[PDB]
Design an enzyme around this catalytic site. Structure first.
Site, PDB file in Angstrom:
ATOM      1  N   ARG A 153     -15.992   5.156   5.757  1.00  0.00           N
ATOM      2  CA  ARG A 153     -15.801   3.551   6.002  1.00  0.00           C
ATOM      3  C   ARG A 153     -15.702   3.303   7.543  1.00  0.00           C
ATOM      4  O   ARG A 153     -16.151   4.245   8.183  1.00  0.00           O
ATOM      5  CB  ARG A 153     -14.560   3.154   5.437  1.00  0.00           C
ATOM      6  CG  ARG A 153     -13.836   1.785   5.472  1.00  0.00           C
ATOM      7  CD  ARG A 153     -12.817   1.982   4.677  1.00  0.00           C
ATOM      8  NE  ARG A 153     -12.141   0.515   4.502  1.00  0.00           N
ATOM      9  CZ  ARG A 153     -10.655   0.206   4.271  1.00  0.00           C
ATOM     10  NH1 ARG A 153     -10.085   1.053   4.517  1.00  0.00           N
ATOM     11  NH2 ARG A 153     -10.463  -0.960   4.079  1.00  0.00           N
TER      12      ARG A 153
ATOM     13  N   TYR B 114     -12.562  -0.036  -4.379  1.00  0.00           N
ATOM     14  CA  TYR B 114     -12.751   1.145  -3.854  1.00  0.00           C
ATOM     15  C   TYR B 114     -13.963   1.945  -4.652  1.00  0.00           C
ATOM     16  O   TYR B 114     -14.128   1.529  -5.595  1.00  0.00           O
ATOM     17  CB  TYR B 114     -11.429   1.900  -3.475  1.00  0.00           C
ATOM     18  CG  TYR B 114     -10.719   1.869  -2.552  1.00  0.00           C
ATOM     19  CD1 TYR B 114     -10.641   0.646  -2.071  1.00  0.00           C
ATOM     20  CD2 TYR B 114     -10.251   3.009  -1.833  1.00  0.00           C
ATOM     21  CE1 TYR B 114      -9.851   0.413  -0.820  1.00  0.00           C
ATOM     22  CE2 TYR B 114      -9.581   2.913  -0.567  1.00  0.00           C
ATOM     23  CZ  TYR B 114      -9.521   1.738  -0.219  1.00  0.00           C
ATOM     24  OH  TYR B 114      -8.780   1.660   1.060  1.00  0.00           O
TER      25      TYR B 114
ATOM     26  N   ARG C  29     -14.992  -8.346  -2.950  1.00  0.00           N
ATOM     27  CA  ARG C  29     -15.365  -7.169  -3.515  1.00  0.00           C
ATOM     28  C   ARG C  29     -15.820  -7.392  -5.109  1.00  0.00           C
ATOM     29  O   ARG C  29     -15.895  -6.324  -6.019  1.00  0.00           O
ATOM     30  CB  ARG C  29     -14.003  -6.396  -3.871  1.00  0.00           C
ATOM     31  CG  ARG C  29     -13.561  -5.440  -2.806  1.00  0.00           C
ATOM     32  CD  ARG C  29     -12.324  -4.675  -2.647  1.00  0.00           C
ATOM     33  NE  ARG C  29     -12.076  -3.544  -1.776  1.00  0.00           N
ATOM     34  CZ  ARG C  29     -10.943  -3.365  -0.961  1.00  0.00           C
ATOM     35  NH1 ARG C  29     -10.356  -4.739  -0.644  1.00  0.00           N
ATOM     36  NH2 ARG C  29     -10.995  -2.277  -0.224  1.00  0.00           N
TER      37      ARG C  29
ATOM     38  N   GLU D 154     -11.175   6.789   4.997  1.00  0.00           N
ATOM     39  CA  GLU D 154     -11.590   7.239   3.778  1.00  0.00           C
ATOM     40  C   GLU D 154     -12.917   7.722   3.236  1.00  0.00           C
ATOM     41  O   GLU D 154     -13.462   7.033   2.512  1.00  0.00           O
ATOM     42  CB  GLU D 154     -10.866   6.135   2.841  1.00  0.00           C
ATOM     43  CG  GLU D 154     -11.503   4.658   3.297  1.00  0.00           C
ATOM     44  CD  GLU D 154     -10.543   3.768   2.422  1.00  0.00           C
ATOM     45  OE1 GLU D 154      -9.418   3.796   2.332  1.00  0.00           O
ATOM     46  OE2 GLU D 154     -11.240   2.574   1.927  1.00  0.00           O
TER      47      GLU D 154
ATOM     48  N   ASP E  87       0.608  -1.286  -0.017  1.00  0.00           N
ATOM     49  CA  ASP E  87      -0.034  -0.032  -0.081  1.00  0.00           C
ATOM     50  C   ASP E  87       0.712   1.449   0.039  1.00  0.00           C
ATOM     51  O   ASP E  87       0.400   2.494  -0.497  1.00  0.00           O
ATOM     52  CB  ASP E  87      -0.985   0.032   1.280  1.00  0.00           C
ATOM     53  CG  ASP E  87      -2.123  -0.976   0.854  1.00  0.00           C
ATOM     54  OD1 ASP E  87      -2.396  -1.291   0.173  1.00  0.00           O
ATOM     55  OD2 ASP E  87      -2.220  -1.524   2.068  1.00  0.00           O
TER      56      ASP E  87
HETATM   57  C1  LIG Z   1      -2.533   4.000   3.375  1.00  0.00           C
HETATM   58  C2  LIG Z   1      -3.446   2.646   3.096  1.00  0.00           C
HETATM   59  O1  LIG Z   1      -2.810   1.750   3.186  1.00  0.00           O
HETATM   60  N1  LIG Z   1      -4.584   2.794   2.424  1.00  0.00           N
HETATM   61  C3  LIG Z   1      -5.229   1.555   2.481  1.00  0.00           C
HETATM   62  C4  LIG Z   1      -5.558   1.342   1.044  1.00  0.00           C
HETATM   63  C5  LIG Z   1      -6.307   0.193   0.593  1.00  0.00           C
HETATM   64  C6  LIG Z   1      -6.501  -0.861   1.796  1.00  0.00           C
HETATM   65  C7  LIG Z   1      -7.441  -1.791   1.599  1.00  0.00           C
HETATM   66  O2  LIG Z   1      -7.320  -2.903   2.237  1.00  0.00           O
HETATM   67  O3  LIG Z   1      -8.034  -1.884   0.369  1.00  0.00           O
HETATM   68  C8  LIG Z   1      -6.184  -0.419   3.120  1.00  0.00           C
HETATM   69  C9  LIG Z   1      -5.451   0.661   3.441  1.00  0.00           C
HETATM   70  N2  LIG Z   1      -5.246   1.161   4.626  1.00  0.00           N
HETATM   71  C10 LIG Z   1      -6.121   1.265   5.579  1.00  0.00           C
HETATM   72  O4  LIG Z   1      -7.331   1.705   5.307  1.00  0.00           O
HETATM   73  C11 LIG Z   1      -5.937   0.841   6.887  1.00  0.00           C
HETATM   74  O5  LIG Z   1      -7.382   1.223   7.717  1.00  0.00           O
END
Ligand SMILES: CC(=O)Nc1ccc(C(=O)O)cc1NC(=O)CO
Ligand SMILES: *[C@@H]1O[C@H](CO[C@H]2O[C@H](CO)[C@@H](O)[C@H](O)[C@@H]2O)[C@@H](O[C@@H]2O[C@H](CO)[C@@H](O[C@@H]3O[C@H](CO)[C@@H](O)[C@H](O[C@H]4O[C@H](CO)[C@@H](O)[C@H](O)[C@@H]4O[C@H]4O[C@H](CO)[C@@H](O)[C@H](O)[C@@H]4O)[C@@H]3O)[C@H](O)[C@H]2NC(C)=O)[C@H](O)[C@H]1NC(C)=O
Ligand SMILES: *[C@@H]1O[C@H](CO[C@H]2O[C@H](CO)[C@@H](O)[C@H](O)[C@@H]2O)[C@@H](O[C@@H]2O[C@H](CO)[C@@H](O[C@@H]3O[C@H](CO)[C@@H](O)[C@H](O[C@H]4O[C@H](CO)[C@@H](O)[C@H](O)[C@@H]4O[C@H]4O[C@H](CO)[C@@H](O)[C@H](O)[C@@H]4O)[C@@H]3O)[C@H](O)[C@H]2NC(C)=O)[C@H](O)[C@H]1NC(C)=O
Ligand SMILES: *[C@@H]1O[C@H](CO[C@H]2O[C@H](CO)[C@@H](O)[C@H](O)[C@@H]2O)[C@@H](O[C@@H]2O[C@H](CO)[C@@H](O[C@@H]3O[C@H](CO)[C@@H](O)[C@H](O[C@H]4O[C@H](CO)[C@@H](O)[C@H](O)[C@@H]4O[C@H]4O[C@H](CO)[C@@H](O)[C@H](O)[C@@H]4O)[C@@H]3O)[C@H](O)[C@H]2NC(C)=O)[C@H](O)[C@H]1NC(C)=O
Ligand SMILES: *[C@@H]1O[C@H](CO[C@H]2O[C@H](CO)[C@@H](O)[C@H](O)[C@@H]2O)[C@@H](O[C@@H]2O[C@H](CO)[C@@H](O[C@@H]3O[C@H](CO)[C@@H](O)[C@H](O[C@H]4O[C@H](CO)[C@@H](O)[C@H](O)[C@@H]4O[C@H]4O[C@H](CO)[C@@H](O)[C@H](O)[C@@H]4O)[C@@H]3O)[C@H](O)[C@H]2NC(C)=O)[C@H](O)[C@H]1NC(C)=O
Ligand SMILES: *[C@@H]1O[C@H](CO)[C@@H](O[C@@H]2O[C@H](CO)[C@@H](O)[C@H](O)[C@H]2NC(C)=O)[C@H](O)[C@H]1NC(C)=O
Ligand SMILES: *[C@@H]1O[C@H](CO)[C@@H](O[C@@H]2O[C@H](CO)[C@@H](O)[C@H](O)[C@H]2NC(C)=O)[C@H](O)[C@H]1NC(C)=O
Ligand SMILES: *[C@@H]1O[C@H](CO)[C@@H](O[C@@H]2O[C@H](CO)[C@@H](O)[C@H](O)[C@H]2NC(C)=O)[C@H](O)[C@H]1NC(C)=O
Ligand SMILES: *[C@@H]1O[C@H](CO)[C@@H](O[C@@H]2O[C@H](CO)[C@@H](O)[C@H](O)[C@H]2NC(C)=O)[C@H](O)[C@H]1NC(C)=O
Ligand SMILES: CC(=O)Nc1ccc(C(=O)O)cc1NC(=O)CO
Ligand SMILES: CC(=O)Nc1ccc(C(=O)O)cc1NC(=O)CO
Ligand SMILES: CC(=O)Nc1ccc(C(=O)O)cc1NC(=O)CO
Ligand SMILES: [Ca+2]
Ligand SMILES: [Ca+2]
Ligand SMILES: [Ca+2]
Ligand SMILES: [Ca+2]
Lengths: 388, 388, 388, 388
Positions: free
Chosen positions: B211, B325, B290, B196, B70
């Site tokens: 969320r 997302y 998803r 987010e 990430d």
């Molecule tokens: C910065 C980052 O890691 N963003 C993310 C993006 C996707 C995901 C995901 O699991 O799709 C998760 C995160 N992180 C979080 O939201 C932790 O609570």
């Protein structure tokens, strides 16, 4: 439009925050990206662009082998908006193996330099058209900043040199006023060898922390008075000192007056700036090689000889990887003229030998009075996935 | 120019019609296309652009292996006009592994975030220049929306968090007013874990269905009063509920007051909006994974606890393929402020393992009071033709 | 700005001169070029652009195999300046497997169509934003022109159909006035099956020489009165007749009133225009296949039944190679509204089978009262050098 | 805007300084770059662009084999900003195997020529739209400058020819005034065979040092009086003489009146300009082949027969490599109209045979009253690394 007259107090910065990065090398293993070196960034009132002297080729071109050489007739000055890599759609603004661009506030000025080392020329392209030129005076690699020149009310001052890498050079400062060189002044002050300056507006003047390939690790300072075309020069007071190679914090010195003669024959383009009696500055984390890059505030560093009282440091590039050239760049704020820097992340030949090419990607932080964490933003390219 | 003050009644929509799609993954097997994630779209008065946090690389770059991670120092925020893929000519507007951009009505604001998880920073680039910054407060992955912030009369509000994925986080809302943060307010109301957010103008305020990675499937709601910098929060009344994973229509619940604690530790960025006592919303067709994405109207969903009275549904992405997302985005009409959404179609590692990369393409429908058929617009990339 | 009201006498043309060509297929064997079909060109007052429904992929993408299929959720409407190929930097203006764009004189209107054949929708994106939409009426491949709609004073008229390829269809004409459909009128007149019209301003009205997949080779004509939203229809008087397949000059007929029932179940998008009692027109040089393309002037062809008095012919595409769809497009001159046409040069599957893809390149001549030689400007791509 | 009326004294130049270079061939071995020939550059008041007749293909396309041929229906006129290579994103402004563009001061005019050699046409696209056309008069490869036409107050004059490579041709000069040809005047004066002229404003007229494929090495001169549409012609007085092949400095001659008949059947597009009684000019360093390129000042060369008094020479392209076509181009200064030239660096078939393609890269210096060193800026492409 009006000219940039920069009459605003320099912002009171707390440190540096992230601004741009282009991953050029990373992308180069999967895209038609150029092979540049000695980059820099500059901005016109509305936006910024990133400059770089490409090697007239791409990394995948076999024409990349031997990209180490500093000057070939094919080095052209590329110019993209800040943030977009040097992809085939990039414009080669002019022919040049050494340059400096600034924007008087109405159009761009581009000091472009090519030709034989012995006898090279310097084209002054302003507002797209070639307004003037000048030729090599000391018949020895007529060079310039590799950073952005600065302009105040219509006159833009670029400091160039021509002389001898490790030896007495003839450095002078031109006052190209809208393409045409309206005056030239030889270097004054104490400084013993000005090379590739990093200049910035200091209303009503211009200040430059430069290099010194001759016999100093402490950085030269060339002040140009816009009012009368004069010049003055010295060295930074800082005891920390920032060139490379240099001695080492404990055993390094400087007195703002003379070259320290501490591993001096050496250099890399660097930057720095005052603020009261203090000095914001940055150097490679390594003192022998160009690896990593740090920044910090030396309390007193500006006005007091050999001060080693550091503060507000930050790792921009972790020590375990390459850095390189570095310049400064200003940006007018709504109330104050902010200060920003960029870092040349070089990859390729000599240091890394798996490959036969030598390109670089950039990174740029900018002054900030806000808060900020900590990080390390290197090049990131796995040399093992790289072409050649 | 003047600022966006959004004083127009929200359009009375009948459903959603097609708007954009970029086939990025499809093109990636035959073009130098970037490798992004957590995308979104926003528009200035005249036109729209599409954002995405690229992986500082292309799919063909071996630098794509491990694109699942990430946050790497190389994630930069890309920005193209709505409809043009992230090809090498795309500008990396700033360094950031988490962001949010909005356009006050005069220029763009870009909340860009990079650095160590433990201690990261957040640059506030406005009008091309870095105006302010802020650092990590809870020293734990300072993050933000991954959608567009919204502005009313000059002040733009982004809600950020910093704390613990599955645990009590410190969420707050900044009021960056033209680059500079003019105020910060900690989260009020009932909500147990805002992450987010998908925000939208609700003159004279801003509303956010977010969320909840902690213990809810029903979506959090964070209302910001522009007038006094206040805050309030709750959860959506909808009984259908839309996060993932979640229980299942028959056995899912919500009371607009507390986390339902129904498979809650989990999440995916989602969106929704009121309309009278009703709630336009959309979730993945699957309740564990998803896959696919649907939308529908829950009569009462806004103002009445645990309402499961659905209506006007639509398959945007058929259930047999991946989604991800999702955020919202508004667009001013000539008479009313329309509502639109986008869908992140993710491909690559973990789920699909033939490849070693993890990129995504988008799809965007927009509110419409007109008529419309039925369809399913997935990613379309044959994973068997894909690189790696 | 003001609206286009087209109140200028149509130029008195002598024939057709060359204007554009993009070599898209040629370049496709050496560049990341898209895989489109059913192209067209349109212009706003200042300049022209070229449209095409890409296959959501490139020729080198294995995703090109099966590009023959007419409608996939991935067909997006591409839009470049007239003369620049569909390279990765091209914007996908919207999702659509059938379209029509025009420029009222202030902004663009884009009738984009996607979804299930049985139940598809039609988004009306105007000025970048989705203003309205409409759904499938006869629940059978709701289609439109695949050419440019035309606007007079603010109202833009697109004629769409939905019904049965070879059978009675429900054709109607919408009067989308600045994104929003301000009226709909069912097809009047004699015409037996309007398909993919080629329309043009005929102040104060709009005229369309269309297709007829049912039982005619002679081209349908749909006149729309802008004044009262009315409609009228008929067929071209020309005895030469121009569709494909068709009988053959000697044995072909038409009476401007009914489908000739001469190989009728068949079609290809064509164009034509009056001028006094005459008819400027163009068809494939071949009467069974789409090979080659010619143009000529039929003296009387407009006002007199079954006239075969030809004149001013020209080979645009030599008979020994492929042609395809064809539409018209107008351009305002300083004194008169000029008439221009484009030719779809299709390559790939079914006809040519060495490859598995089916793309096309265009060619565009424009009316001219000047002089001109003779030539033949085909696609030029050596199918043996082509990918797949 | 107003028209360019060029009423400014020509600058008093000291020599030539560097301006642009695009490394197109170098990049071609590592990027989707076009395969052009017969290039040129022109500028509108604000900026410059570079033109070139591409081969409707890229170097990597197998469609490059046989790129030697001069006219194929696929040659389209490319147009980029001065400095950005012909990458897939380049616009093909029109179909043409021979051209000339100029900018009256309000919009661009593009004389584009295609079609059968025997019977070709010439489209006059002005302001994006096709305004007029003309057809082949002597039914023999109707050609034009391959350089930029010039305009004074609204009328733009292009000199075209149609006749016989080595033999009496019918050369004439059109006065296309805003797209439409307002007058045509047959060539007057002594000149025996005008081909591909290099023209330049000489307020209130236009002057052209052209070619002569028939029986002269000394360059033809075609003066057009803008006032009355007249014409006059002669040859340059210079004894040095500059075409190729030519005799050799010692044994070459010219009398400003007749073809010297000294290796005359031969040619290459060249340029030159007066200045008092002197003549600034440039030719290939080689007198048999197109290798290298030099420039110099012939004192008297303008007004005195067979003058061989040279001065101010310069090697632009070292003798050890290829040169080619060459034209002139003017640029308005703030006080005087500057003079500039470009050099076509051709690579590929016939001369070099390792490859099967024939493309070229450019180089452009510009007049300068400043100083300048010495250099040699060739193509630089290692033919051994090149495709095919
Ligand atoms: C910065 C980052 O890691 N963003 C993310 C993006 C996707 C995901 C995901 O699991 O799709 C998760 C995160 N992180 C979080 O939201 C932790 O609570
Ligand atoms: C904001 O955030 C900073 C981030 O600063 C920078 O940290 C990165 C790593 O150094 C840097 O590359 C990046 O660019 C950031 O700008 C917060 O603090 C900083 O982060 C880390 C952790 O606190 C510090 O990193 C150091 O470097 C090594 C790699 O991360 C790490 O291993 C070092 O620690 C060793 O010492 C610790 C105690 O300090 C000890 O617990 C371990 O033993 C550890 O391990 C080594 O030592 C032994 C042998 O010598 C063995 O255990 C084993 O072999 C191993 O080699 C060290 O932690 C970084 O220095 C730190 N401080 C600062 C001031 O940056 C900071 O909280 C915040 N500050 C500000 C001003 O915003
Ligand atoms: C506008 O247009 C819609 C389109 O809606 C969506 O339909 C697509 C497919 O579901 C979707 O992916 C896309 O995104 C569209 O948005 C019109 O109606 C809809 O289209 C189809 C057909 O009517 C429906 O699709 C369902 O999914 C399967 C694949 O298409 C299909 O096989 C399903 O049917 C099974 O049941 C039918 C009766 O319903 C029966 O005849 C068959 O037996 C069939 O076969 C399965 O069943 C048996 C085993 O269980 C065996 O026969 C065999 O093994 C097989 O597995 C089903 O039809 C979609 O649900 C439908 N309705 C709606 C409301 O969307 C709609 O006309 C119009 N509506 C609106 C509001 O605009
Ligand atoms: C402007 O310029 C035109 C150009 O018109 C078009 O010509 C191209 C070729 O046809 C076309 O593809 C391109 O797009 C142009 O628009 C001038 O005239 C035209 O050009 C040529 C030559 O005059 C004509 O071309 C025809 O097609 C064949 C290929 O070029 C050619 O072989 C045909 O000729 C056969 O007949 C001639 C007499 O006509 C005879 O001498 C030979 O025998 C020749 O050979 C065949 O016949 C025998 C067997 O049947 C054997 O000899 C052998 O096996 C071989 O197969 C024919 O010439 C084109 O038709 C012609 N006229 C026109 C009106 O276009 C024109 O001068 C001028 N016109 C205008 C209005 O601007
Ligand atoms: C500005 O800068 C110029 C640069 O002018 C151009 O020079 C480049 C090379 O010629 C050219 O390609 C580039 O485009 C520049 O525009 C300064 O002077 C010039 O540079 C060089 C050196 O002075 C001259 O170059 C000539 O070409 C050969 C390669 O560089 C070189 O080998 C030639 O020299 C031979 O003669 C010298 C004496 O002249 C002698 O010492 C050697 O013997 C040498 O070697 C050959 O000769 C023998 C056999 O014949 C053997 O030794 C051996 O086998 C070998 O083959 C020659 O030097 C260039 O001509 C020169 N002058 C000029 C006027 O350009 C200039 O200082 C300045 N001028 C201006 C107006 O700005
Ligand atoms: C520096 O530049 C600024 C901008 O041109 C000058 O200030 C503006 O002009 C007049 C006189 O100062 C004021 O009414 C404006 O309000 C000023 N602009 C702003 C934004 O304050 C200034 O005078 C210039 N010269 C100097 C010496 O600072
Ligand atoms: C919201 O923004 C609009 C646009 O600035 C404001 O309305 C305009 O300004 C005056 C006073 O309302 C009217 O003459 C204009 O006709 C309005 N424009 C339009 C398009 O109607 C409005 O006042 C702003 N403020 C609020 C609170 O709505
Ligand atoms: C068609 O459009 C033109 C352009 O708007 C209108 O003519 C202009 O407006 C007034 C009244 O005609 C004249 O002074 C201008 O000179 C006209 N422009 C030009 C270029 O001639 C015209 O009236 C419109 N309406 C109709 C019915 O033709
Ligand atoms: C050539 O063009 C220039 C620019 O249009 C004309 O000069 C301008 O117009 C008037 C009358 O000369 C002066 O007040 C301006 O100052 C002139 N502009 C400049 C920049 O000096 C000129 O008259 C044109 N015609 C001729 C014959 O030279
Ligand atoms: C023109 C040129 O060679 N520029 C350089 C660039 C980098 C370096 C470098 O060593 O990184 C050196 C030079 N040259 C010098 O500064 C000589 O004092
Ligand atoms: C949507 C769509 O299929 N458009 C087409 C394009 C080309 C063709 C074609 O056959 O070239 C046909 C269609 N469809 C029809 O016109 C059916 O009457
Ligand atoms: C149309 C065309 O062939 N242009 C040319 C280009 C280059 C050359 C050349 O030989 O470089 C020749 C021509 N043709 C001529 O000039 C014939 O006199
Ligand atoms: Ca040194
Ligand atoms: Ca959850
Ligand atoms: Ca038919
Ligand atoms: Ca000759």
């Amino acid at each position: 439009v009006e000219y940039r007259n920069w009459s605003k107090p320099q912002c009171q910065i707390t440190g540096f925050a992230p601004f741009s990065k282009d991953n050029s090398i990373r992308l180069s293993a999967g895209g038609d990206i150029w092979v540049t070196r000695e980059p820099y960034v500059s901005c016109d009132p509305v936006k910024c662009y990133q400059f770089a002297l490409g090697q007239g080729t791409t990394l995948d071109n076999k024409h990349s082998n031997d990209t180490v050489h500093d000057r070939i007739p094919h080095r052209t000055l590329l110019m993209n908006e800040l943030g977009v890599p040097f992809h085939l759609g990039t414009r080669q603004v002019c022919i040049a193996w050494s340059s400096s661009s600034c924007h008087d506030g109405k159009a761009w000025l581009h000091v472009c330099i090519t030709g034989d080392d012995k006898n090279a020329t310097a084209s002054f392209i302003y507002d797209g058209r070639l307004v003037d030129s000048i030729g090599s005076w000391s018949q020895n690699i007529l060079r310039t900043q590799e950073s952005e020149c600065v302009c105040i009310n219509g006159t833009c001052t670029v400091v160039m040199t021509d002389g001898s890498a490790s030896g007495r050079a003839d450095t002078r400062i031109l006052f190209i006023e809208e393409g045409k060189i309206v005056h030239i002044s030889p270097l004054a002050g104490s400084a013993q060898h000005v090379e590739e300056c990093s200049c910035y507006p200091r209303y009503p003047g211009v200040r430059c922390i430069c290099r010194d390939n001759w016999k100093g690790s402490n950085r030269p300072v060339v002040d140009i008075n816009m009012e009368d075309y004069s010049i003055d020069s010295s060295y930074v007071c800082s005891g920390l000192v920032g060139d490379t190679p240099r001695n080492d914090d404990r055993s390094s010195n400087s007195n703002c007056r003379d070259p320290n003669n501490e591993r001096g024959t050496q250099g890399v383009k660097g930057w720095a700036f005052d603020n009261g009696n203090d000095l914001w500055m940055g150097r490679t984390i390594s003192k022998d090689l160009r690896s990593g890059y740090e920044t910090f505030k030396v309390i007193g560093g500006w006005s007091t000889p050999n001060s080693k009282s550091q503060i507000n440091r930050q790792v921009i590039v972790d020590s375990d990887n390459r850095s390189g050239y570095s310049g400064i760049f200003s940006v007018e704020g709504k109330s104050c003229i902010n200060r920003c820097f960029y870092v040349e992340l070089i990859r390729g030949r000599k240091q890394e030998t798996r490959v036969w090419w030598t390109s670089n990607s950039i990174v740029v932080f900018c002054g900030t009075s806000g808060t900020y964490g900590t990080g390390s933003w290197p090049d990131g390219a796995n040399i093992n996935f790289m072409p050649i």
